[PDB]
Amino acid sequence: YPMAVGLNKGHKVTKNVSKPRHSRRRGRLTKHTKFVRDMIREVCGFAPYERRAMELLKVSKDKRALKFIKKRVGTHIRAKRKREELSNVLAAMRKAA
Amino acid sequence: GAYKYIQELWRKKQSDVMRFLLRVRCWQYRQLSALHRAPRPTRPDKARRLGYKAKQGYVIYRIRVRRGGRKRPVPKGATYGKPVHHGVNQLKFARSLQSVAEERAGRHCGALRVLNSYWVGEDSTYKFFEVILIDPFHKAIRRNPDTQWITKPVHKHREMRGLTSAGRKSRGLGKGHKFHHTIGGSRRAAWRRRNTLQLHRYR
Amino acid sequence: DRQTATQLLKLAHKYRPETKQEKKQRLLARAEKKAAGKGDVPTKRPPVLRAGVNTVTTLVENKKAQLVVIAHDVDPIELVVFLPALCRKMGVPYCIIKGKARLGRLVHRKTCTTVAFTQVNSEDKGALAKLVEAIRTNYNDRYDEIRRHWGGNVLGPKSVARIAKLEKAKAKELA
Amino acid sequence: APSRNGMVLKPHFHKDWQRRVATWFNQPARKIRRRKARQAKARRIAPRPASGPIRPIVRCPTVRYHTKVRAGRGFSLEELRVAGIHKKVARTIGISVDPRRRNKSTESLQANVQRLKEYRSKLILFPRKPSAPKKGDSSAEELKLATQLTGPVMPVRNVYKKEKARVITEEEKNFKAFASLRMARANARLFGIRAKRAKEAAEQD
RNA sequence: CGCGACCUCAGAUCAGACGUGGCGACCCGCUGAAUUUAAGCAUAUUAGUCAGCGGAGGAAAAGAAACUAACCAGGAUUCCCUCAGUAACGGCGAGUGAACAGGGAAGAGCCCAGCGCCGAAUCCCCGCCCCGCGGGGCGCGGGACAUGUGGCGUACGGAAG
RNA sequence: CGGCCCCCGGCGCGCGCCCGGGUCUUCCCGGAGUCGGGUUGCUUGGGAAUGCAGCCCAAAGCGGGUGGUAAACUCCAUCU
Ligand SMILES: [Mg+2]
Ligand SMILES: [Mg+2]
Numbered sequence: 001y002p003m004a005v006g007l008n009k010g011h012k013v014t015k016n017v018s019k020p021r022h023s024r025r026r027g028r029l030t031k032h033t034k035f036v037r038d039m040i041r042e043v044c045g046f047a048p049y050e051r052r053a054m055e056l057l058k059v060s061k062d063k064r065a066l067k068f069i070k071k072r073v074g075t076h077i078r079a080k081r082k083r084e085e086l087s088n089v090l091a092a093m094r095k096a097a
Numbered sequence: 098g099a100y101k102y103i104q105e106l107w108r109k110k111q112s113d114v115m116r117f118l119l120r121v122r123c124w125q126y127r128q129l130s131a132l133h134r135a136p137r138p139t140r141p142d143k144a145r146r147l148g149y150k151a152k153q154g155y156v157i158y159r160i161r162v163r164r165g166g167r168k169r170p171v172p173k174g175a176t177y178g179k180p181v182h183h184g185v186n187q188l189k190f191a192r193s194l195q196s197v198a199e200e201r202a203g204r205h206c207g208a209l210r211v212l213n214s215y216w217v218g219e220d221s222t223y224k225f226f227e228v229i230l231i232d233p234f235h236k237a238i239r240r241n242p243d244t245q246w247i248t249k250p251v252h253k254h255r256e257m258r259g260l261t262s263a264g265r266k267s268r269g270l271g272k273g274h275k276f277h278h279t280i281g282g283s284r285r286a287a288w289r290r291r292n293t294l295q296l297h298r299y300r
Numbered sequence: 301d302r303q304t305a306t307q308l309l310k311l312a313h314k315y316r317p318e319t320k321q322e323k324k325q326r327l328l329a330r331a332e333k334k335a336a337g338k339g340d341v342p343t344k345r346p347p348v349l350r351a352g353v354n355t356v357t358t359l360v361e362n363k364k365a366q367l368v369v370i371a372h373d374v375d376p377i378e379l380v381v382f383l384p385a386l387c388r389k390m391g392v393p394y395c396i397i398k399g400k401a402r403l404g405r406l407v408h409r410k411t412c413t414t415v416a417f418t419q420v421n422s423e424d425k426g427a428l429a430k431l432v433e434a435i436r437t438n439y440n441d442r443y444d445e446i447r448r449h450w451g452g453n454v455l456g457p458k459s460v461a462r463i464a465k466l467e468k469a470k471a472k473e474l475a
Numbered sequence: 476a477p478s479r480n481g482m483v484l485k486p487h488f489h490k491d492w493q494r495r496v497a498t499w500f501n502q503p504a505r506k507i508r509r510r511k512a513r514q515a516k517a518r519r520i521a522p523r524p525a526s527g528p529i530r531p532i533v534r535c536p537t538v539r540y541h542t543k544v545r546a547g548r549g550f551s552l553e554e555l556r557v558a559g560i561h562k563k564v565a566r567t568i569g570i571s572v573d574p575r576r577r578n579k580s581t582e583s584l585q586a587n588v589q590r591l592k593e594y595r596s597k598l599i600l601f602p603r604k605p606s607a608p609k610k611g612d613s614s615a616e617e618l619k620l621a622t623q624l625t626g627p628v629m630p631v632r633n634v635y636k637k638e639k640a641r642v643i644t645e646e647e648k649n650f651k652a653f654a655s656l657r658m659a660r661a662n663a664r665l666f667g668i669r670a671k672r673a674k675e676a677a678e679q680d
Numbered sequence: 681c682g683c684g685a686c687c688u689c690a691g692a693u694c695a696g697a698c699g700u701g702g703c704g705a706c707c708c709g710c711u712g713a714a715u716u717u718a719a720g721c722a723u724a725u726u727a728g729u730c731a732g733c734g735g736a737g738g739a740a741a742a743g744a745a746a747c748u749a750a751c752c753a754g755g756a757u758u759c760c761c762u763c764a765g766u767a768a769c770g771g772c773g774a775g776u777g778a779a780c781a782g783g784g785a786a787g788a789g790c791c792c793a794g795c796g797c798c799g800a801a802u803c804c805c806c807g808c809c810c811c812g813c814g815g816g817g818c819g820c821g822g823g824a825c826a827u828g829u830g831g832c833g834u835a836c837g838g839a840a841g
Numbered sequence: 842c843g844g845c846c847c848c849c850g851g852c853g854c855g856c857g858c859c860c861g862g863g864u865c866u867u868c869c870c871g872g873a874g875u876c877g878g879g880u881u882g883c884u885u886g887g888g889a890a891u892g893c894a895g896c897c898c899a900a901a902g903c904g905g906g907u908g909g910u911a912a913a914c915u916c917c918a919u920c921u
Contacts, residue, residue: 001651004751006659007666011752014581018553021577022838022870023921027904030870032795033101035361037902040105042447043385045112049898072898074878076913081901099357099829100794101871102382108873111899118377136688137375141828146793146872153804153825166882166895167711178713180722189882189894192710200709200734207699216874234698237804237825243791250737257735259709268709269884269892272747272756274909277779278885278892282741282758283708288728291778293495295760298502318799346799352827358796373687375828400828401686410686412827476719485775487765489717491729502760509785527787536754537781545782548755552837561862562837566788574837575745575755577919583752 041089049073050082054090057083103142123218126225132160132205135227139217144229147213147262154235156209159217159227160202166190195263198226200256206230210247211255213262304434305397308369311427312406312415315349319408347421351407353379356416357386365392366417367432371400374413383414388443393436517622524623528571529594530630531587546630549573554587558595570594594628 002012049072057065062083069079069086110119122139138144138157149155167190169176174185195214203211209230218225232238233248246252255261259268269279281287318326333339350356350365359365360383368387374380387394397403404412420428439446455463477483517525531554533547549571555562566572570591578584599615602608 001655003656003659005656005663007662009751013583013752016579016581016584018578021920022836024919025836025838025870025903026921027902028870029902029904030795032098032869033902036098036101036105039386039389040102040109040382043382044106044109044114047109047111047899049111071879073900074876074898078877078900081904085901098361098795099354102357102386103376103378103828104794104872106378106382108875108900110874114381115378137828139828140376141379142794143872145829148792150830151826151828152802152830164895170711176713181724182713184882187882187895190710191883191893193894196709204734208697209699219874232698235804236697241803246791251740253737254735257709258707258741259735260741264709267893270742271892272743272745273907274748274779274887275891275907278887280779284892285709285728286707286741289495290759292490292729293497294492295497296499297761298499323799343799348799350799350827352829354829355827375687379828399686404827405685407827409827410825414827485765487776489726489775491726494729512786533754534752535782536749536751538751540782541751541753543782545754548787551755559863571787572837573755575747577753577755580752 050086053083054086057087058090058094100142103140107140107142119218123220123223123225126159126161126218127220127223132158132202135159138227138229140215140227143215144227147215147229149212149229152237154232154238155212156230156232157227158202158206158230159225160198162194162198162224162226164194164219164222164224192259192267193263194224195226196256196259196261196267198224199228199261199263202226202228203230203254203256208232208234210252211261212247302398304431305395307427307431308395308397309402309406311420311424311431312349312369312403312417314424315347315417315420317348317351317407345419347419349406349415349417351409351412351415353383353414356414357383359416359418360387360390360392363390363392364418366420366428367435368392368394369403369415369417370394370396371403371413372396372398373400380413384439385447388440391440393432393440395435395439522618522621523569524627526624526626528566528569529591529627530571532583532590532630532632534583544631544633546626547573547576549576550587550591551576551578553578553584554591557584557588558591560591560595568600569598590628597628 002010004010049069053065053068056068066079066083069082070076073079073082106115109115135157137151138149139159141149141151144157145151149157167188169185169188171185174183176183176185195216199211199214202214203209210233212229212231214226214228216225217227231244231247238244239248252260256264259265269284270276278284279287281290330342350359356365356368360368365387368383370380370383384394384396400411400413403415404410406412406415417428513525528549530546530548531550533545535541535543535545551573552562555565555570555572560568560570562572562574599618600610601614602610
């Protein structure tokens with residue numbers, strides 16, 4: 001019972017299951033490159049918007065520590081990929097001790 | 098794997114090991130002249146990913162540009178216009194400062210074609226840029242047939258037409274719905290194509 | 301110093317890569333033998349030092365290196381700044397020699413910024429295996445002694461004498 | 476300026492318009508110019524056809540136009556993969572290649588795979604000096620004509636099912652009606668909300 | 681201190697090359713008003729045009745998706761017909777105002793940096809002769825560039841062993 | 842229609858370069874003061890900012906851009 005409107009829309013056609021394109025894989029971590037960026041946060045250091053951000057994250061507020069990165073890195077969804085990995089580097093500096 | 102370390106170290110320029118020599122050679126460039134010849138590109142990874150090849154032929158000027166948007170060159174602010182046209186002090190100059198840097202670097206040398214350029218320093222007033230050049234008529238560039246695309250004479254003065262990487266960022270073009278403001282060729286070609294009257298022969 | 305680094309520029313000197321007048325005539329005696337003799341392998345190991353950053357960088361993250369002779373001044377300061385921390389992390393030793401143009405004449409070029417060791421001759425391995433200890437004593441045993449350290453921040457000799465004269469007038473008051 | 480009953484008009488001649496106008500007094504001159512570039516091109520090359528390569532079969536984008544068939548751009552590799560020819564070999568054989576085209580059906584995929592081998596069926600090649608690596612005899616007994624026209628294998632072929640005649644059965648004449656759409660649409664804008672009202676019964680506890 | 685290696689630099693009527701200027705019909709980048717219309721007139725309009733300034737070519741610009749789509753999916757750019765004087769903008773006034781679909785013209789595709797292997801297998805100049813036109817070459821020897829990285833294979837449609 | 846002169850693209854000896862294909866195994870895989878956000882000017886039909894530019898803040902890698910009403914969550918679509 002095909003129908004062009006509703007929930008199961010459209011002409012019933014079979015679907016090809018096939019290996020995805022190679023431009024579709026852009027930002028996989030690829031272990032050679034994780035070795036670079038883990039070697040480099042001990043030869044270069046951190047920034048002064050995140051030296052302060054951990055020392056609000058380790059103690060006082062984590063809403064405001066989100067809301068400090070929210071103001072200083074662009075979007076809200078970029079700040080939930082900074083805050084919960086500022087805490088991770090702070091975790092492996094705390095729970096490796 | 099060396100240049101991947103040079104890339105990623107340079108891409109963190111607010112840490113303290115970077116912003117020391119990020120700013121000790123802001124000072125070290127501000128005492129030289131306005132336009133200048135560096136003998137070798139002072140960040141080698143970026144210049145060659147734009148197309149530098151360390152051989153005979155290329156030459157790498159760093160030049161200086163004063164920062165800030167343009168002030169309207171009208172005497173005593175008297176623009177003599179309707180009140181939407183009194184813009185003396187808040188105007189922003191729709192071509193980027195990186196392409197002004199490529200212009201006067203390519204303006205001084207008449208015989209040097211320009212490939213593209215990149216960012217190497219800022220004070221508060223000055224905004225420095227290396228500019229990498231290509232000599233057309235050297236025999237190491239007139240041979241090597243993957244570089245003979247620049248000795249062709251339609252690539253004379255790729256700034257004052259706006260054909261570099263930095264200049265064409267400000268032309269407005271591109272593909273998509275975001276850039277069909279300029280959907281034919283360039284910005285004032287679509288204005289001819291839309292705003293002409295295309296009466297037929299059997300009209 | 302110039303004394304411990306005397307051996308290193310003389311140990312490496314017999315691993316100087318192939319210059320012009322011997323590259324021209326190594327192709328020839330291999331050719332004069334090729335139509336007569338059919339030798340399988342003249343050089344099973346080349347005892348040679350590698351040149352340049354983009355060779356020496358790769359040969360540490362495969363651990364194919366023995367020792368890293370690294371230079372003092374570079375056109376871009378950073379070009380080099382990761383290579384001490386990279387070799388300590390992998391564990392291949394490194395030493396910082398005076399002048400990027402003193403090791404440039406190990407290879408017949410102007411400035412070569414790094415040389416490293418992959419295979420020394422095993423009959424002169426003990427010359428390498430005597431001074432590679434003192435190299436990783438000075439550097440790789442001292443990473444958190446060298447990583448922490450800051451440089452500069454010392455006043456000029458005309459602006460420190462007027463500071464130290466004020467120490468007289470307090471140590472005169474306490475007399 | 477307006478009078479008794481008429482249209483209200485916005486004629487776009489307030490802008491300067493007499494300095495960009497384009498009379499087509501050369502459109503006969505441009506038609507018989509670009510017929511010389513088809514006469515003296517299709518003879519200049521080869522017994523290769525005019526009107527370019529083989530294009531594949533392509534079904535249109537708009538809901539408005541998905542019921543119809545169009546000469547597309549290139550067989551997007553996969554049709555070169557199921558039929559098994561090399562991609563950089565394909566565009567010197569006379570087969571167009573469009574790599575950024577995808578296939579998310581098996582119905583449409585074999586619709587060109589048979590088409591490609593059908594093109595490869597009606598293809599004859601000229602080997603250089605007649606040692607003939609993987610081409611047969613004298614030139615298909617001869618080339619039989621010089622040039623082909625308006626597309627190789629008639630790229631429209633908007634075919635349709637006969638579907639001759641049928642007996643209306645019991646199930647077919649009772650059910651499939653208008654009320655099968657009003658409840659179909661009612662499971663389009665009252666479906667996500669009914670996912671949420673069942674969460675109300677899982678928090679009633 | 682004297683000699684030397686480099687690094688940043690100068691000087692030259694050094695050897696050999698190169699750029700400026702003119703035209704500007706079409707093209708490219710930037711700066712760009714007012715008369716006019718609104719029956720007045722400040723937003724708007726005229727207009728991103730006139731003028732000004734710089735860039736070239738026989739065409740230029742554009743270009744091989746950081747796309748259009750939301751169904752049975754299309755597939756670089758440019759141009760014409762339609763979309764359409766429509767969506768949308770506007771003292772929502774005066775007025776300005778695209779694009780995707782669809783049909784045609786033409787339809788050509790590709791390169792690199794980077795990650796890696798090959799003992800710089802790369803290039804310029806200089807001198808000799810091969811030997812050929814009105815000259816450009818593979819040979820033969822000598823100075824450079826270059827390891828802060830030349831050349832082969834390589835480009836995301838995957839690639840390498 | 843001829844004859845007369847000069848120039849064009851396409852014979853064949855001596856030049857010069859010169860192994861591709863399908864499966865399996867493993868390995869590699871990417872452009873930063875840039876993307877984006879805040880504000881300010883110009884601009885567009887682009888309307889809760891379409892493009893452009895200045896100044897500040899300045900990224901990440903299952904990450905990023907887009908999906909034409911600001912936003913948070915949740916899948917997906919396409920692209921690199
Ligand atoms: Mg030089
Ligand atoms: Mg001309």
